[PDB]
């Protein structure tokens, strides 16, 4: 709301103003009135009141009040409207401004973007936090310096980074689309004050740098090139780096789509001055025990469970409660889990030392205590987690935990039935009104530290002290290496892999397998692994990312993985995988680690990455498990991102107003007609304060797209009960008409869009896989961004229609498509339809998304079919049902086969259908061969809190659909088998009479 | 007696089931729990043995060459039933001293026989349909409770920061009491001597309105606290109900699944199963 308990304040309202002479003066006001207006009218009536004798001029005073976030806020921007003040209650205090005004204004801006006041970090006792807050700045500082290493070109590369592919090589069927390896390309320029546009159609080589394109235009060659830079017409996308032209994403897809590239010439100096040169200010916050080593303590690990404050359990329904406990390294227990005795629900008290089969010096660095309080209800009985909590056995300074501590536990995530949650975050619940478990660790007359690397190598040599690699072996290493990240290795394979650990360096990508063969509960073997990891060859980023999931918690392993990313991960692929990399931060034991340093640095040296870095972090701020971590991270970013914070604040402000509006629609107007809801909406949007917020800002879907004036007459609510908003902005680029005149975005508030965000990411990666192999199977991964708790944006796809919209007899679809393309362009459309169909058919089967129907499926004018509304994937409705089978979400009815068969009535038997069949077959195998990437991507998401992605068991569905336990030949037959079943025999097998 | 029985009749033999199914069967089980499945067709080996040891699942592959079976060369067992029966009576320390455990607890494919012996395919396929609807009814019961749970947890969070915002506000209005009190011990004293009761009157009127405003805001905060306690109790109550549904839910699913496996043997038309669902 815009005042506590209230969604919108009335046109007028009274305000208790509290003068510095202790007076209290009411004041009639307007909701859009500004502070300057308020102060003026306030001091007016102040003269009506006692003792205005001691009142100075307004110029000497400022306004202060309380916000919704319970912070005492000082309003320096006295042009800000009363309804945008975010007052808790409608009162204002007027006092003498004091202290660094700059820091205070920045602080409140960061806190606004961050969704929480920075001052809440100040009063955090925990040292790891304050250590993070200070240390992380070193990276921020380091970042802004890389941004000036070559000013002013360094400045522009940050704000307008080249949007390029990873490699300048073109796949064969992309090069084949050029004219003799050349591309037709249109350039425009400003003429006079009237600034009219004019064509200069070029036809140059694809491998050309922007310099050449800049050169040719004028038709002193090396004279005036560096006077100008190229811009994309419609976007704020630029060409600042010496990349081959065809390596830019926009050019590449133009080539791909058969679209003609339209660039705009612009004075290099004209942009370089639009750059703020934004500087970065250092914020204000800028025992003689002789510590023992961990390896010196000859003791078995034991932990004491004392008591729990309470659990929420009906005393009638549950027999006993107990504490379940485990020592975990990642997701694997290091020894047997140990329960406490069973006690009544009415008195949760234990006071028993639990003993574990682990010798203290054998505790690995990443070891964790995982616990939960469990309820228990012939001899058969059921066991259920009531609340859970995880604890790092070592803190961020390598100190072993000791003595009494309290642990406030967490709610069990929906659908989780494991008695323990080793994948959950560690540390206590910040909410103290919650079940609290007391425990005691041994204290060892001292402070216990995990050994330094020096001592670890020391022990590594000793361990080992106290051969031709045969061909037989050499092939088994290959075989093992080809297993997918969830194909468990056998004990024979572990023993073998370990025995040949030294030879394994020859074949570096087997590192995940080798790390799984290490006895992690033995310092001997771990010490030896550390040495190997120290000098290990780097591996491809796609494989390095495997090592960042919850199954490789060890900092050395993670360290190597991060280091692989520093060298080999391009910004293009970084953008592609950003969702998972951010999600994986939840697996990190500590606030300070190499990955967060690497990510923050990238976010601060590339505005495009920083943009989505911000949003993915922000979207989860409501989630109290990562609130602190992400909040801290966000403060760092916002402090050092320079001018973009202002751009980001307009995005946050615009979204918050869309949130307030849809809130009002959903609860305060749930039983009003759509027709009256729209008119309400319109009246609100019409207001000056709204038009200021909702116009002239950057699209969070794509920061290169500027959203200008709202076309309010064409904005609509939609049919769903969530009341999604169909919004329409003017594209205010002066070259607008050459790309798109208007931007349409669906604002949805009420549904989880993360699943769709994920599904669409995957689809893009799939299309990418196929393209790099000569399979032009064109997909439509439209924009979808989660920006908060069940709040997000969806890009509208223009010139598309549902299948039903066509239908409303099995020949109509082909007939429609025919009319829309009638002529020599008919075969570039039955084509596009067929390819599209193959990709989405294979993609939806592998992923197991929700059942397709005539609203689920859409077609563009030019033939391209795509899907929308994925919601559920990996067959999540496997919970209600009980079947093991793998659905085929997208069955091709005669309607589609007829379109594929260009009209033919024998559509299951034709050169066309069988040609279509081979496309799917090739697409399927293509993905199966890149199974690792997809399994790894899914594995990084297990902590996300997505109901469909809680356990490794959930990811097992694509091992099934990709038949990874099977042979490649069997995998194809399996696919065919699945199609024939769904298409009721009507999917012609290799059993055909020719 | 034992060793002559066919592998196909052996209880711990499940044939072609996946590592995943094996995983659910083995979760949270005691050491020595085990079962044998067909090896994956892409690797070498005929069968994989999976056992519990120290909280983990151990996968040990069983190979075959020329009539003989084993974990490694030399292969010295005559049949799989023989191999297994050996280690049901001898610790696997013999094969690997690092693996001290024997194969104590089989996982029967005739285990469903204990919870159901009921014989008619349709007497079972109707109980399944009944347990299933019992299950989905409780499923929805628990889901509705979960949306109350989240909605309530959030509103409590809203209320809590509102309490904090009320306290900051009360703090200010009381500092405005100090600002008013302090700025008057002399500027009212000077109208006391001279008896300017004229003006004293409307300072008191102003001071009173300050006290009056303080008082009403403390009422509001007080009313919010009672609403907070009320809703916190609603929340804890909600959490109790879910905790009574949880055990019944798992069992209902466990029971339904058992009946799904029993109907998977006897190979029921999977289109029948769908109508039974």
UniProtKB/Swiss-Prot annotation, chain A:
Residues annotated as domain PI3K-RBD: 180-267
Annotated InterPro entries: ARM-type_fold, C2_domain_sf, Kinase-like_dom_sf, PI3/4_kinase_cat_dom, PI3/4_kinase_cat_sf, PI3/4_kinase_CS, PI3K-type_C2_dom, PI3K_ABD
Stored Pfam families: PI3_PI4_kinase (PF00454), PI3K_C2 (PF00792), PI3K_p85B (PF02192), PI3K_rbd (PF00794), PI3Ka (PF00613)
Domain of life of the source: Eukaryota
Span of domain PI3K-ABD: 9-98
EC number, as in UniProt: 2.7.1.137, 2.7.1.153, 2.7.11.1
Sequence intervals crossing the membrane: none
Mutagenesis or variant effect for residue 488 to Q: Found in an endometrial carcinoma sample; uncertain significance
CDD domains in the cross-refs: C2_PI3K_class_I_alpha, PI3Ka_I, PI3Kc_IA_alpha
Recorded consequence of changing residue 99 to V: In CRC; likely involved in disease pathogenesis; shows an increase in lipid kinase activity
Disease: PIK3CA mutations are involved in various type of cancer. Most of the cancer-associated mutations are missense mutations and map to one of the three hotspots: Glu-488; Glu-491 and His-983. Mutated isoforms participate in cellular transformation and tumorigenesis induced by oncogenic receptor tyrosine kinases (RTKs) and HRAS/KRAS. Interaction with HRAS/KRAS is required for Ras-driven tumor formation. Mutations increasing the lipid kinase activity are required for oncogenic signaling. The protein kinase activity may not be required for tumorigenesis. Colorectal cancer: A complex disease characterized by malignant lesions arising from the inner wall of the large intestine (the colon) and the rectum. Genetic alterations are often associated with progression from premalignant lesion (adenoma) to invasive adenocarcinoma. Risk factors for cancer of the colon and rectum include colon polyps, long-standing ulcerative colitis, and genetic family history.
Family statement drawn from the similarity comment of this UniProt entry: Belongs to the PI3/PI4-kinase family.
Name listed for the protein in its UniProt record: Phosphatidylinositol 4,5-bisphosphate 3-kinase catalytic subunit alpha isoform
UniProtKB/Swiss-Prot annotation, chain B:
Lineage: superkingdom: Eukaryota
Tissue specificity field: Isoform 2 is expressed in skeletal muscle and brain, and at lower levels in kidney and cardiac muscle. Isoform 2 and isoform 4 are present in skeletal muscle (at protein level).
Processing and modification events after translation: Polyubiquitinated in T-cells by CBLB; which does not promote proteasomal degradation but impairs association with CD28 and CD3Z upon T-cell activation. In adipose tissue, polyubiquitinated by the BCR(KBTBD2) E3 ubiquitin ligase complex; recognized by KBTBD2 through the SH2 domains, undergoes 'Lys-48'-linked polyubiquitination leading to its degradation.
Residue ranges of every copy of the SH2 domain listed in the record: 12-107
Modified residue annotations for Phosphotyrosine: 146, 259
Function as written in the Swiss-Prot or TrEMBL entry: Binds to activated (phosphorylated) protein-Tyr kinases, through its SH2 domain, and acts as an adapter, mediating the association of the p110 catalytic unit to the plasma membrane. Necessary for the insulin-stimulated increase in glucose uptake and glycogen synthesis in insulin-sensitive tissues. Plays an important role in signaling in response to FGFR1, FGFR2, FGFR3, FGFR4, KITLG/SCF, KIT, PDGFRA and PDGFRB. Likewise, plays a role in ITGB2 signaling.
Family statement drawn from the similarity comment of this UniProt entry: Belongs to the PI3K p85 subunit family.
Implicated disorder: Agammaglobulinemia 7, autosomal recessive: A primary immunodeficiency characterized by profoundly low or absent serum antibodies and low or absent circulating B-cells due to an early block of B-cell development. Affected individuals develop severe infections in the first years of life.
Subunit (UniProt): Heterodimer of a regulatory subunit PIK3R1 and a p110 catalytic subunit (PIK3CA, PIK3CB or PIK3CD). Interacts (via SH2 domains) with CCDC88A/GIV (tyrosine-phosphorylated form); the interaction enables recruitment of PIK3R1 to the EGFR receptor, enhancing PI3K activity and cell migration. Interacts (via SH2 domain) with CSF1R (tyrosine phosphorylated). Interacts with PIK3R2; the interaction is dissociated in an insulin-dependent manner. (Microbial infection) Interacts with HIV-1 Nef to activate the Nef associated p21-activated kinase (PAK). This interaction depends on the C-terminus of both proteins and leads to increased production of HIV.
Domain notes for this protein: The SH3 domain mediates the binding to CBLB, and to HIV-1 Nef.
Official protein name in the record: Phosphatidylinositol 3-kinase regulatory subunit alpha
Gene: PIK3R1
